[PDB]
Amino acid sequence: TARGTPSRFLASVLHNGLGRYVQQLQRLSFSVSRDGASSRGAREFVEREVIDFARRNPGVVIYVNSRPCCVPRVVAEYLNGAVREESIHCKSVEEISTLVQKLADQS
Amino acid sequence: LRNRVTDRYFRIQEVLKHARHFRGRKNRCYRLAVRTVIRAF
């Protein structure tokens, strides 16, 4: 609800796209587990799709942490100090690809 | 008394987090709040 939530105006980070476009995604941290059935989709994503994404986005640093966890997560750090923690628990590889791409195109 | 409900706190609080900026007892009492959040939406 508009009256119960904050609001803002349309804006860019630093007049983005005026001189040149700067990708606002900076870091992607993938907490994934070796043995988690909830983490199976993220396991497939790390197996197949993260190499091509990292090649397509050279300005983004991608860390992958394989550790015992129940809920696999991705933390997107943006250049204006923004942090987005999102659960990729029980998502297929194409859903994870859609989500990670969406995070890349966000500001 | 097997199978009691344990996350009733969280269900109450999602309705109350939508009801927080109201006036009176309807911002904190769940019955009056849930009758008003629905109307707000």
Partner: protein
Amino acid sequence: RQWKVTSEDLILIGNELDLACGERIRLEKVLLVGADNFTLLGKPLLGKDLVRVEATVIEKTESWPRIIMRFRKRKNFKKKRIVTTPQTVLRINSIEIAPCL
């Protein structure tokens, strides 16, 4: 929609535009162009040789969650839905005119 844009501007399109971010496109259906001391009016669209608008896809995002709740009383009628419309932020770079009148 009809947008009154200028150079170095921002607009928010309420759908995805099948374009990568930071991509330079040309807006073409120019209903009006104008400056101080003169304006040009299309009937209803100006010539593409006459006027160019240049825009840049700078953001592809989603909207804030919108609530759809339906309630009919004494009939147990109550329904809730959450939607997130995709959005595209374009920066209008330049508006150029050519001598063709």
